[PDB]
Design a protein around this ligand. Structure first.
Ligand code: NA
Length: 130
C-alpha cells in the first residue's frame, strides 16, 4: 500500500519511532519518502551484489531479513523478507529499530545522508498533528 504523508506520520508515532535512539520522527519520514515514496510493496534488486531491498524503508536482505537467495547473508531482524512487504508496517518498524541500534544509526541508509542529513526536514511532518 502507498501511505498518505500524514497517515504514515501518525502511524510511526504510534509505533514509538519518534526519538527512537535519538532519531526524530521527521527523519524517519524523510527516509521513507526517499527510499520508497511511502510504498510498502517496493522492492529493488541490486544486481551488483545479489541482494534485494524490501519495503517502505528498503531494508537489505544481506543483513536484516532472509529471502534465501542472497549469498552469505544474515537475518539480524529474524524475519522473512516477505514480512517487510505487508500493508501493516509493524514488522518493518521493528526491523528498522534493529538497524539503528548498530553504531551507524540512521546513517546505515545512504539515501538519508544524501537527502535528509543537515536539511530542514520539518516539512515531512508539518500539519500532521504529531
Ligand atoms: Na538475509
Amino acid at each position: 500500500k502507498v501511505f498518505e504523508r500524514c497517515e504514515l506520520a501518525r502511524t510511526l508515532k504510534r509505533l514509538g519511532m519518534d526519538g527512537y535512539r535519538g532519531i526524530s520522527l521527521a527523519n524517519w519520514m524523510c527516509l521513507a519518502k526517499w527510499e520508497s515514496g511511502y510504498n510498502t510493496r517496493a522492492t529493488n534488486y541490486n544486481a551488483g551484489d545479489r541482494s534485494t531491498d524490501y519495503g517502505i524503508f528498503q531494508i537489505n536482505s544481506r543483513y536484516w531479513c532472509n529471502d534465501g537467495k542472497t549469498p552469505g547473508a544474515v537475518n539480524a531482524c529474524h524475519l522473512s523478507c516477505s514480512a517487510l512487504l505487508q500493508d501493516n508496517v509493524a514488522d518493518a518498524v521493528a526491523c528498522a529499530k534493529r538497524v539503528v541500534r548498530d553504531p551507524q544509526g540512521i546513517r546505515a541508509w545512504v539515501a538519508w545522508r544524501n537527502r535528509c542529513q543537515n536539511r530542514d526536514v520539518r516539512q515531512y511532518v508539518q500539519g500532521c498533528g504529531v
